[PDB]
RNA sequence: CCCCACUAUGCUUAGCCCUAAACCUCAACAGUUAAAUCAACAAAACUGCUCGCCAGAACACUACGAGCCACAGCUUAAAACUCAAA
RNA sequence: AAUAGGUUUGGUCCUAGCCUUUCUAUUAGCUCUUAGUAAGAUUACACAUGCAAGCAUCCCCGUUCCAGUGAGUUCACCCUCUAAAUCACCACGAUCAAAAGGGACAAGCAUCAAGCACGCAGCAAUGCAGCUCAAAACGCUUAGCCUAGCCACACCCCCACGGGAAACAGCAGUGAUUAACCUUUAGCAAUAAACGAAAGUUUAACUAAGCUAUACUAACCCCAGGGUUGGUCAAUUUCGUGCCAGCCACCGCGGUCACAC
């Protein structure tokens, strides 16, 4: 009703950013194998519009379907960078982390 | 999933539409009638057996109006089929005429007018149908006043009819199921439905035309 | 094989069943060309009546006439069917007795 | 036997044992878990057992997993309105996580019965047709009604062959 | 059945279907029954049409439909 | 499938084997085949009398009122089944064909009487 | 119609029986010729064990057996295969009487592959391409396609 | 096959070729020695995980195609005919 | 492949393939009593003849449906939007549903591994250099499909101005072709469709019949045949033949005692 794009919200990973104001995103979904009854990732490429070209290869992003595709393949837009590559803020504490270790102790600000 | 374009289906479509607009048959060709065989030479189709009498006697609208100063503007034209069926005055007030110039006697064309069916005038003038029919008759000027004279009779009529038996039984069971207790009858409001006669002039401006396929 | 290996490959693809001399058809119509005999492979010893016929498909194969005795001649019409002749290698077609020119084996 | 550890997961009976049916809001689900550590043990078991059950019930919901990106595991759902729901699942068992997301984002037993009852009105018993859709194909299967001519030959008076000959 | 491009038969070229004979009484009486029947059925049709609008409007903007969307949204908060 | 023009109609879809007619009331497109694809099945009609001597007519009044309010027409046989039930008025031709049958049977009683009277 | 089918089956059965009797005399002669040789082929090894015969029989094959003849039939130059296609049955039976009065087989044989009624078809061209014959269409036509194929 | 003589070659430098019964015929990682030990033989039997490969014999370390400093080459690699076994 | 069986060897075990027993559908041969029901060209090759679309007071509408076929083949499903159409009508919204947009969707071959312009931005000028693909792009071959049904085609050139050229893939029927073979019936009485204000008219749709062991159901005083008979696998008397003639699904039989011809 609000948009003609099937996928309204999808989370992916920026594989490449070689187009102006556009980010190539790889989205993975779990598809069941009817015979083995096991879930496997079936990936798909999405073209997102990044006005400020703030995306970096390797970061997780959130896409929001546009009302109507602005281009032949661009159907979404960059809603927000979930995990910035190398600079992710733990949502539970809001503190920087470099893997499974805190770069800034959570106790600094109690 | 990239459909291979079909250009010849679009080129032909434009050409066929264009030819239908430049070779279109006129009213003189479409609506001509052989009065001995009672067929339409254009298509070779016999008329119905109930029309044959009237195709040899009455006149078409524009073989009456082609004898008048401005194709009979502001004049009343009735129809033989109305005078027999309905006593009340039924007529069209002519307001605009588009004659067919390709007829040698200018006996075809179109006409717009104000209908007055059974004494009830219409607010605005639309296009007249059944121009080609052999059923028309022109109201003389001096009779225009005694032909138009009409007094409306009382229109009192049934306003509500019963529901059919089963529906009525199901309308009285909802009431009692919901708890409502009443002794009134369910009745249908038939005052909205204005039943018009089957011979009421329809709209000729939403009606089609014969294709240009002469036979 | 692992589940990941089984997912990439997929359902086993059954080799397309090959067709025989009848091209997957019950019978076939053919014209007799020759009428010779062939010897079985060891350890069987006999002379088996066979015939080279050109089928309606266009090919020209060797057929085996069953029964005791026959009167098949060049240009005749016979209905062939499948069924390998075990003694004769390379003979995969059998003439239908009682059809077209070929007639039922006379009793005794 | 069935390959892999815990092969019962790859069964229709186990995939249909999930009681977590998300609402229409839930569009994307993200699971962040740590491969090692005692605190993250429940999340690892949640991804090993329960994730298949959720995706089977919610096939149009995207479920993405990320390993060792943060010091602690957490779940985050993305609704269609733009709201993000963070669920810290550290120091928790897999059963608690499955019961926690069924209360804040899952449907109850009342809302699910209604859906199933709507599908019972699509298959009317009175309707006649193929066995796939309807119970009976014709009304000759109903005791009392004239049987099919295949099983019981009709009387000569009810057949159009003799009627025509009888008439002329 | 035939199409538009199929030629007509040569046995029907000279065929004229004469209309049936008319009984003045029955025909006039039968023309009024249809007049009333169709007026009684047009009113029912409108009634049935009026029940389909309500139901449609009683599900998206109804009092019992807007009272549950707030209950579902209040429980979500 | 898409048809140029057309509309919906509540008609009868003939079924059953030879000399055993069974109709099943359906709402279907005007241009669709008699026993082809249908939108919904609204009942069934068994012409042949049963052991008890009655003809069974199933009517889904609730769904018949929905499709009549969506723009569906009615066929003459289906308009005569609802007049017999009491959902619709008696079709004019059900009343006129009953009057013709009366005159017919009253015209034959004269001959029968005359024969027994005159002869 | 079924009564008609019964008569035809009886007539075909009667015809088939007659042919068999003519063929039976052919076979009975053909079988006897081989049986005479076989009963005379093992007179040399009379009252001997089969194993004894095998050794001599295997050696005997070398002495008196020449190279095997080709199974494929070898075309003869002075042979004419003809396919007669007529328009009416009575006209075809008139051309067969002219081929039944041919007495020059010593110089050139004449083989009537196939004879029928109707226009030249594909089965006629295929039979003439198999036996290297000629198609003689008496008062019949041959479609362009057939001409191209031939 | 035995004896004698001698060459390419084996060696160095610089390029190529890219093969082996390249076989410890027993994949990499982690782990166990309990239970039914385990067809046989050989170098006891198993578990988890992953990659690679394989589904009668022969045709076939072939043919075609592609690629390659390889032009009697290497790699990859079918089918038809045939057997009822190997 | 199953409750399995037979067959490798001098012999045993293991592995493995072929076959057997089960159930259907064509066709062939020999044979065949009736009744009722269902189904019913081999072929997108060519077609004599006849019928298959009319209605109606002249306009319109309809003949764009049904019926048919299976050549080709990821247009069939969901969402969004929104024409035509029905609900008498203006309006309303509902229903139905195309085009357009987004998504999804056959099989085999990787000895089809690279495609070759397949992208983005920007009001525009125009600029940047991209896009798809070993999770199978591009390509080749095959095939109607996911069956209350749907898709597609409608002599051919995808299309149909135009050209070739003169069309049964409508019913019945024919020729050719194939192992493959239904009547050149009747009636609009029921239902459906079309037209009409309507009574009504029309309809090779359909209905009711015809032919045919293809199949199911039922029956019969008289009326039974076909194929088997070494083992697997139920069941052979006596002659004749003498590795000949012949036989078998597999293993195998027959060389003067053949339960195998
Ligand atoms: C159990 N049967 C064993 C098998 O016999 C087989 C044997 O079959 C042979 C084929 O006929 C021949 O074309 C095939 N010849 C080929 N050029 N392919 C022989 O290889 C084959 N023998 C075999 N594979 N051992 O001869 C056949 C007639 C046999 O009797 C059929 O059943 O093989 C034999 C030895 O070859 C044994 O003696 C038999 O015991
Ligand atoms: S199935 Fe109901 S009559 Fe044959
Ligand atoms: K033997
Ligand atoms: K070694
Ligand atoms: K097809
Ligand atoms: K085409
Ligand atoms: K009728
Ligand atoms: K009309
Ligand atoms: K004996
Ligand atoms: Mg054998
Ligand atoms: Mg030297
Ligand atoms: Mg070494
Ligand atoms: Mg390795
Ligand atoms: Mg092999
Ligand atoms: Mg080598
Ligand atoms: Mg090589
Ligand atoms: Mg090569
Ligand atoms: Mg043995
Ligand atoms: Mg075995
Ligand atoms: Mg048979
Ligand atoms: Mg159709
Ligand atoms: Mg509209
Ligand atoms: Mg569309
Ligand atoms: Mg190749
Ligand atoms: Mg095809
Ligand atoms: Mg075309
Ligand atoms: Mg044709
Ligand atoms: Mg036909
Ligand atoms: Mg024929
Ligand atoms: Mg058949
Ligand atoms: Mg007729
Ligand atoms: Mg029939
Ligand atoms: Mg015997």
Q: Which string of DSSP letters, residue by residue, matches C49-105? A: EEEEEEETTS-EEEEE--SS-----TT-EEEEEE---SSSTT--EEE-TTSTT--PP
Measure the CA–CA gap between D168 and D165, rounded to whole angstroms.
Answer: 5
CA G87, distance to chain mean position in Å, is: 26
Which residue of B lies nearest to F88 if distances are taken between CA atoms?
B164
Residues in chain C: 108
Measured in angstroms, the CA of C14 and the nearest CA of chain D are apart by 23
How far apart are the CA of C14 and the centre of ligand 17, in A? 29
What share of residues in chain G are helix, strand, coil (percent, to 5)? 55, 15, 30
CA atoms within 13 A on the CB side of B133: 15
Cβ separation A28–D64 shorter than 8 A: yes
Give me the domain span that covers residue F51.
1-115
Among D131, D135, D136, D140, name the best residue to mutate to test ligand 2's pocket (greatest count of ligand atoms within 8 A of Cβ). Answer: D140
Across the strands, what pairs with F25?
Answer: F12
Of the residues B167, B174, B193, the best mutation for testing chain E's interface (the one with the most E CB atoms within 10 Å of its CB) is B193
Query: Three-state SS for B59?
Result: strand
E strand or H helix at G112: strand G109-117
Whether B137 CB is under 7 Å from strand I: no
What's the angle, vertex CA C3, arms to CA C1 and CA C4, rounded to 5?
Answer: 100
Say how far apart CA D105 and CA D26 lie, in whole Å. Answer: 8
How far apart are the C-alpha atoms of B95 and B114, rounded to whole Å? Answer: 8
Q: From CA D122, how far away is CA D117, in angstroms rounded?
A: 9
Strand H: residues with CB below 7 A: C 1-5, 18, 20, 86, 89-90, 92; D 3-5
Q: Which two tokens stand for residue G93?
A: 């039976």
Q: How far apart (Å, rounded) are the C-alpha atoms in residues B26 and G33?
A: 97
- Residue F12: both structure tokens together: 């009868």
d(CA G108, CA E60): 100
Query: Tokens 């996580």 sit at which residue?
Result: D97
Contact D42, D56 (CB under 8 A): no
**What is the distance between the alpha carbons of residues E22 and F54, in angstroms, rounded to a whole number?**
37
**Residue B65 DSSP one-character state:** G
The residue behind tokens 């009858």 is B185
> Which candidate, B200, B98, B93, B102, places its Cα nearest to that of B139?
B93
Among F14, F16, F23, the mutation site with the greatest number of ligand 2 atoms within 8 A of its Cβ is F16
How many angstroms separate the first and last alpha carbons of chain G? Answer: 41
| Phi then psi dihedrals of residue D61, to 5 deg | -100, 130
In sequence order, what are the beta bridge partners of D76?
D30, D86
B196 Cα distance to chain centroid: 13
Method: cryo-EM
Put simply, whether F85 touches B (Cβ < 8 Å) is yes
**What are D54's two structure tokens?**
């959720």
Mutate to test the interface with D, among F22, F40, F51, F53 (most CBs of D within 10 A): F22
Question: CA-to-CA distance for C101 and C73, rounded, in angstroms?
Answer: 9
Tell me whether residues F19 and D160 touch, CB distance under 8 A. Answer: yes
In 3-state terms, what secondary structure has residue G4? helix
Taking the centre of ligand 7 as the mean of its atom positions, its distance from the CA of residue F75, in whole angstroms, is 14
Distance of CA A54 to the CA centre of its chain: 13
Cα(first)–Cα(last) distance of chain B, in Å? 44
**Residues in chain B closer than 8 A to E43 (CB atoms):** 161, 188-190, 192-193
Report how far apart, in Å, the C-alpha atoms of D106 and of each of B24, D21, F34 are: 68, 5, 47
D91 touches strand I (CB under 7 A): no
Q: Determine the Cα–Cα distance for residues D13 and A23; give it in Å rounded to an integer.
A: 42
Q: How many CA atoms lie within 13 A of B63 on its CB side?
A: 17
Return the number of other C-beta atoms located less than 10 Å from residue A63's C-beta.
Answer: 26
User: What are the residues facing D65 on neighbouring strands?
Assistant: D31
How far apart CA G53 and CA D164 sit, in angstroms, is 84
DSSP letter, residue A48: E
A39 touching C (Cβ < 8 Å): no
DSSP calls for chain F:
---SS--EEEEEEEESSTT--EEEEEEEETTS-TTS--SEE-EEE--S--TTS---EEE-HHHHHHHHTTT-EE-HHHHHHHHHHTSSPPPHHHHHHHHHHHHHHHHHHHHHHHHHHH-
Q: Which two tokens stand for residue G109?
A: 């044989």
The gap between C98 CA and I26 C1' (Å) is 20
Instruction: Let me know if F104 is exposed, middle or buried by CB neighbors in 10 A (0-12, 13-18, 19+).
Output: exposed
Q: Are B163 and B186 in contact, with CB atoms under 8 Å apart?
A: yes
Compute the distance between CA of residue F72 and CA of residue F7 in angstroms, rounded to an integer. Answer: 7
- Packing angle, helices F92-118 and F76-85, rounded to 10: 80
**Where do the H-state alpha helices sit in chain B?**
8-22, 27-30, 52-55, 80-85, 144-148, 165-178
Neighbours of G79 (CB within 10 A): 14
User: B5 in helix, strand or coil?
Assistant: coil
Which structure tokens are listed for B55?
Answer: 């195709």
**Strands in chain B per DSSP E:** 39-40, 45-46, 76-79, 91-99, 109-117, 120-121, 126-127, 136-138, 160-162, 187-189
- CB of C105 nearer than 7 A to strand I: no
Taking CA atoms only, the protein residue closest to ligand 2 atom 3 is D148
Angle between helices F61-68 and E24-60 (to 10 degrees): 100
Work out the widest C-alpha separation in chain E, in whole angstroms.
83
- Asked if chain E contacts chain F via 3 or more Cβ pairs within 8 Å, the reply is yes
Q: How close, in Å, is residue D11 to chain C by CA atoms?
A: 14
CB D141 within 8 A of CB D151: no
φ/ψ bin of G24: left (φ > 0), alpha (ψ from -120 to 50), beta (otherwise): alpha
Ligand 2 pocket (Cβ < 6 Å) reads D 138, 140, 148, 150; F 16-17, 20, 22
CA of C91 to C1' of I178 (A): 24
From the number of C-beta atoms within 10 Å of its C-beta (0-12, 13-18, 19+), residue G142 rates as middle
Task: Write a three-state SS string for D92-141.
Answer: CCHHHHHHHHHHHCECCHHHHHHHHHHHHCCCCCCCECCCCCCCECCHHH
Given the CA of residue D140, which atom of ligand 2 is nearest to it? 2
Is it true that the peptide bond before C43 is cis, omega within 30 degrees of 0?
yes
C3 interfaces chain A, CB cutoff of 8 Å: yes
**CB of A107 within 8 Å of any CB in chain C?**
no
Q: What does the block give as tokens for B80?
A: 């033989």
Choose which residue among D130, D134, D145, D148 to substitute to test ligand 2 binding: the one with the highest number of ligand atoms within 8 A of its C-beta: D148
Which residues does residue G83 pair with via DSSP β-bridges, in sequence order? G114, G135
Break chain B into its structural domains and give their ranges. 26-153, 154-195
Q: Count the neighbouring beta carbons within 10 Å of the beta carbon of residue F20.
A: 23
Ligand 13 centroid distance, CA of D33 (Å): 29
SS3 C36: strand
**In contact, A58 and D52? CB cutoff 8 Å:** no
- The torsion angle over the Cα atoms of residues C53, C55, C58 and C61, rounded to 10 degrees, is -40
Ligand having the closest approach to the CA of C44:
3
Alpha carbons D85 and D75: distance in angstroms, whole number: 8
Cβ-based burial of D77 (10 A; exposed 0-12, middle 13-18, buried ≥19): buried
Q: H/E element holding G82?
A: strand G79-86
Report helix, strand or coil for E24: helix
Report the 10 Å Cβ neighbour count for B193: 16
Q: Using an 8 Å CB-CB cutoff, list chain D residues near A37.
A: 10-12, 15
Phi/psi of residue D64, each to 5°?
-120, 145
Q: Indicate the SS3 state at residue A13.
A: strand
F3 Cβ under 8 Å from any chain B Cβ: no
Token digits of residue G129? 């391409």
- Touching chains E and A? (3+ Cβ pairs < 8 A): no
State whether the beta carbon of A108 lies below 7 angstroms from any atom of strand I: no
Residues in a beta bridge with C30: C55, C78
Rounded distance between C-alpha atoms, residue D165 and residue B77, angstroms: 61
Dihedral, CA of residue E40, residue E41, residue E43 and residue E47, to nearest 10: 140
Strand G109-117 and strand G79-86: pairing?
parallel
- Count of domains for chain F: 1
Helix (H) or strand (E) holding A26: strand A22-32
Spatial separation of the C-alpha atoms in residues B198 and G95, rounded to whole Å: 79
C4 in contact with D, Cβ within 8 Å: no
C106 burial (CB, 10 Å; 0-12 / 13-18 / 19+) is middle
DSSP one-letter code for D79: -
Closest Cα to residue D84, out of B30, B64, C52, A60? Answer: A60
């Amino acid at each position: 009703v609000r948009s003609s794009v099937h996928a309204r919200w999808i989370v992916g990973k920026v594989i490449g950013t070689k187009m102006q104001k556009t980010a190539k995103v790889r989205v993975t979904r779990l598809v069941l194998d009817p015979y083995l009854l096991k879930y496997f990732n079936k990936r798909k490429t999405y073209f997102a519009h990044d006005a400020l070209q703030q995306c970096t290869v390797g970061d997780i992003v959130l896409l929001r379907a546009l009302p109507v595709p602005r281009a032949k393949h661009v159907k979404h837009e960059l809603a927000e960078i979930v995990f910035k590559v190398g600079k992710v803020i733990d949502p539970v504490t809001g503190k920087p982390c470099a893997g499974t270790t805190y770069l800034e102790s959570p106790l600094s600000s109690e | 999933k990239k459909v291979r374009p079909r250009l010849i289906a679009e080129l032909a479509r434009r050409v066929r539409a264009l030819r239908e607009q430049l070779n279109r048959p006129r009213d003189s060709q479409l609506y001509a009638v052989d009065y001995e065989t009672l067929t339409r030479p254009f298509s070779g189709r016999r008329l119905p057996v109930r029309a044959w009498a009237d195709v040899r006697r009455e006149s078409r609208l524009l073989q009456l109006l082609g004898r008048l100063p401005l194709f009979g503007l502001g004049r009343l034209v009735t129809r033989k089929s109305w005078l027999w069926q309905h006593d009340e005055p039924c007529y069209w007030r002519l307001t605009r005429v588009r004659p067919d110039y390709t007829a040698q006697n200018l006996d075809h064309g179109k006409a717009w007018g104000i209908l007055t069916f059974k004494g009830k005038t219409e607010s605005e003038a639309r296009e007249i149908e059944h121009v080609m029919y052999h059923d028309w008759r022109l109201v003389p000027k001096h009779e225009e006043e005694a032909f138009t004279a009409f007094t409306p009779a009382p229109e009192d009529s049934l306003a509500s009819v019963p529901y059919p038996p089963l529906l009525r039984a199901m309308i009285i069971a909802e009431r009692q199921k919901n708890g409502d207790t009443s002794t009134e009858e369910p009745m249908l409001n038939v005052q909205r439905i204005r039943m018009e006669p089957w011979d009421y002039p329809a709209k000729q401006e939403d009606k089609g035309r014969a294709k240009g396929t002469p036979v | 094989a692992t589940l990941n290996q089984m997912h990439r490959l997929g359902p086993p693809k059954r080799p397309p069943r090959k067709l025989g001399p009848t091209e997957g058809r019950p019978q076939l119509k053919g014209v007799v060309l020759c009428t010779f005999t062939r010897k079985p492979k060891k350890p069987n010893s006999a002379n088996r009546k066979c015939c080279r016929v050109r089928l309606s498909t266009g090919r020209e194969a060797v057929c085996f006439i069953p029964g005791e005795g026959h009167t098949l001649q060049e240009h005749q019409i016979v209905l062939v069917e499948g069924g390998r002749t075990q003694d004769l290698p390379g003979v995969k077609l059998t003439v239908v007795r009682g059809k077209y020119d070929c007639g039922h084996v006379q009793k005794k | 036997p069935m390959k892999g550890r815990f092969p019962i997961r790859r069964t229709l009976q186990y995939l249909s044992q999930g009681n977590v049916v998300f609402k229409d809001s839930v569009k994307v689900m993200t699971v962040n878990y740590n491969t090692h550590g005692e605190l993250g043990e429940g999340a690892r078991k949640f991804v090993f057992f329960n994730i298949p059950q959720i995706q089977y019930k919610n096939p149009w919901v995207q479920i993405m997993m990320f390993k060792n990106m943060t010091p602690s595991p957490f779940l985050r759902f993305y609704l269609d309105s733009g709201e993000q729901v963070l669920v810290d699942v550290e120091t928790k068992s897999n059963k608690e996580i499955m019961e926690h997301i069924r209360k804040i984002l899952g449907k109850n037993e009342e809302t699910l019965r209604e859906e199933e009852e709507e599908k019972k009105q699509l298959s009317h018993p009175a309707n006649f047709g193929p066995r796939k859709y309807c119970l009976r194909e014709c009304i000759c299967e109903v005791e009392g009604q004239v049987p099919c001519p295949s099983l019981v030959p009709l009387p000569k008076e009810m057949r159009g062959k003799y009627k025509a000959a009888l008439k002329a | 059945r035939k199409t538009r491009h199929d030629p007509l038969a040569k046995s029907k070229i000279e065929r004229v279907n004469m209309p049936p004979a008319v009984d003045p009484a029955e025909f006039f009486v039968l023309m009024e029954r249809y007049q009333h029947y169709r007026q009684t059925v047009r009113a029912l049709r409108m009634e049935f049409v009026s029940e389909v609008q309500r139901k449609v409007h009683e599900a998206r903007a109804g009092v019992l439909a807007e009272r549950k969307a707030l209950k579902d949204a209040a429980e979500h908060r | 499938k898409a048809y140029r023009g057309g509309h919906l109609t509540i008609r009868l879809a003939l079924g059953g084997c030879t000399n055993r007619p069974f109709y099943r009331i359906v709402a279907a497109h005007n241009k669709c085949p008699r026993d082809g694809r249908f939108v919904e099945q609204l009942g069934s009609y068994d012409p042949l009398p049963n052991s008890h001597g009655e003809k069974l007519v199933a009517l889904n009044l609730d769904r018949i009122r929905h499709w009549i309010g969506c723009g569906a027409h009615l066929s003459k046989p289906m308009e005569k089944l609802l007049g017999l039930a009491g959902f619709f008025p008696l079709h004019p031709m059900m009343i006129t064909n009953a009057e013709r049958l009366r005159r017919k049977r009253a015209r034959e009683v004269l001959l029968a009487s005359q024969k027994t009277d005159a002869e | 119609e079924p009564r008609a089918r019964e008569v035809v089956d009886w007539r075909k059965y009667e015809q088939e029986q007659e042919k068999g009797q003519e063929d039976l005399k052919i076979i009975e002669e053909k079988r006897k010729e081989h049986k005479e040789a076989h009963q005379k082929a093992r007179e040399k090894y009379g009252h001997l064990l089969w194993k004894k015969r095998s050794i001599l029989r295997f050696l005997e094959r070398k002495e008196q057996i020449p190279l095997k003849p080709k199974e494929k039939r070898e075309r003869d130059s002075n042979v004419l295969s003809v396919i007669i296609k007529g328009d009416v049955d009575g006209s075809v039976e008139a051309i067969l009487n002219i081929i039944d009065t041919y007495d020059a087989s010593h110089e050139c044989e004449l083989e009537l592959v196939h004879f029928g009624v109707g226009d030249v078809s594909a089965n006629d061209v295929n039979l003439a391409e198999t036996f290297d014959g000629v198609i003689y269409g008496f008062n019949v036509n041959a479609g362009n396609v057939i001409q191209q194929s031939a």
